[PDB]
Amino acid sequence: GLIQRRNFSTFASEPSVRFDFNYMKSVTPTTEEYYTYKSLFEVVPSTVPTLDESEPFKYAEIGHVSKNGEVFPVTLSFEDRDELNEDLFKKIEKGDIFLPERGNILISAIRPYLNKIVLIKEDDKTDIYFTKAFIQIKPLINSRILYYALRTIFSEKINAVSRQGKGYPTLKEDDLKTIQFSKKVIDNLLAKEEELISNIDALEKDIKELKSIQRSKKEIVDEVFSSHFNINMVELMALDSQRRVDVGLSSISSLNSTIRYSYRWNKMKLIQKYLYRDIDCIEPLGKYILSSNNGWSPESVVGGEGIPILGQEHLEFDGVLNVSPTKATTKTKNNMENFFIQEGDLFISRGNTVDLVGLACVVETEVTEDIIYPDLYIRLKIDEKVIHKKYLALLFNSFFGRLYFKYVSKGKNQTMVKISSNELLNYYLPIPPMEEQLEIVGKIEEQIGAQNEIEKQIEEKRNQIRVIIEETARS
C-alpha cells in the first residue's frame, strides 16, 4: 500500500481532530496558493417549498441523477398517492424536499465520488425539486465555471473529506467549507471564460443532438421482429398482464414429458398460442441441435493470475460476445481445451433473473487468447444450413426468446432462474426460409451498428470537454 508518515501536529488541522488515512493522505505540506470557500461559492441553508396541490410537479433522488449530471426527474401529482410511490410522498411530507434557486450547483452528500454534481442553469423552465441530500452551493464566479472546475478537476479533494464512519461514504457541508482550491485553476479558467463556455456549449449541444436520436440496445431487436412478423406491440404486453390462466387435467400432458403443472408453464403455453396465430414457420429446435455443452466454472479471483473466465454480464441483447473477461482462474481440469470459446460458437445463458435468462450470443470477435466459459453458459452447435446462428441469438434476445424463457425456465430460487437442455430441445421457434433470414439480421445489424457508432461520439465529446478543461486549467 503506502508508507505515509505524518507528524502529530497535522491532526490539529480541521475542527474534528480526525486522523483517518484518507484525510491525512490529502493534507500534505503546501507552498502554493490557498483560497477558501469565501471567494468562490457559498452554502445555502435548506428550506421547505410551497408545493401546489393541483399540478404535477417533479422530484429527484440521488439515483435519479447520473455521473454526467443529467437529472431524470419523476412526475408526482398528490392526486395519485399510490402505494408504489407512497414512500416518495411520505418523505416529501417529512420535509426532505427543496427547490433550487436557478444558478446553484447541487452536490450529493452520500458517496461524492460518483460525480453527482448537477447544474441548475439560469435560463431554463420546468422547475424540479430535490432531496435534502443535495447541497445548494450557489456560486459567485459564474455557475458554469465552478461546475466545470468541480466535475473533472477538484475531485481528488472533495472525495478526500468524506466520512466513512462504519457505513456510508458521506460528504458534509462543514467539511465542504474547508477545501483549499488553488487560484491558478480559477484564475486561468476565468481568464479563458469568454471562449471556454462557448466551445463547451457547442460540445454539449452536439452531445444533446446525439442523445436525441439514441435508442436502446433492446428495442431495436424488439421492433424488427415486431415489424417483420406482423405482430402488434400493444397486446402481447397486455395479454401478459392478465393473470387468470385456467387449464384442464388433459392439457397437462400435452408436450410435457415431465408432467409440469406450474402456473408459469401454463401461461407460456397460452402466450405461444398467441405469438404463432399468423406465423407459419414454426419448427422444433430439437431436430436442428447437434450437441450441447455447459462449460467450466472453477473458483475465480477478480483481476488475478490465470486463464480468464467470462460471466453472465458479457452476454448482451445483440448476439455478440462482449469478450471482456474480469475473473481469472488458476485451476486445471485435464480437459481445459474443451472450453476455450473460439470464434463462431453460440452461447445461450443458463442461470439469471426471470427476464435475463435465455439471452444467446455469437462469438464474432477474433481472440487468440483462450478464454473459458462458465457452467452458466450452454454451447449450442446447430446445423449451419437452416438456422443461421446469429438469427437464432437475435430471436433468443427478442420477445420470442423472452416471453418463453420467462415462463418455462425452472428453479425454486427465481433470482437465479435456470434453463435446461429439455427446454432447448422442446422449443418451437418460428424458422422462416433462409431467404427471409439474413434480412431481419442485417437490418438489425446496421441499426445496432449505427447506435454503437453514436455511442462513442457521445463519449468523445464528453471526453473532449474534460480534456479541454484540463488543458485550459493547466496553461
Added chain:
Amino acid sequence: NKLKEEYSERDDEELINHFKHGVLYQYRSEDILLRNKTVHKILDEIRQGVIWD
C-alpha cells in the same frame, strides 16, 4: 540443517514456489517471515519505524 546467513531474509524469490509446487508443498513453512533489512510489506515496515519502549 538451517538457512544461510548470506541471504537470511528471503528477498530473492529463489525457489519459494518450489515449496508449494509439490512434495515440498507438504513441508512448507506456514510462518510469518520477520525481516530487518528490507520490507516489501507493511508488517516488517512497522517492526522498523516504531520505537516501542
Added chain:
DNA sequence: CTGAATATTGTCGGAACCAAGTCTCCATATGGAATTAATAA
C-alpha cells in the same frame, strides 16, 4: 415580582447498513461406460 427553568417539539447526524439488481460455484445423481456373469446358440 426577574428568572433561565424543563418540556416538549422538529430536525441535523449517522448507521459491525442493506434494499435493488443481478451474477455463481459447487454437491450429487446419472447414466453410461465400463464391466460382469449370463444367455442363447
Added chain:
DNA sequence: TTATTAATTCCATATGGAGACTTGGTTCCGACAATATTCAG
C-alpha cells in the same frame, strides 16, 4: 457355442441450490436545539 442382453460397477456431464455477491443511496432512530413551559420562594 458364441454369442447374448440384462445385469452390474465407475467418471464426466447435467441439473439444481431454505443462494450469494455487488454496486450505490435509501429509511430512521436518536440526540438535541429550541423551545417551553414556568412557579417559587
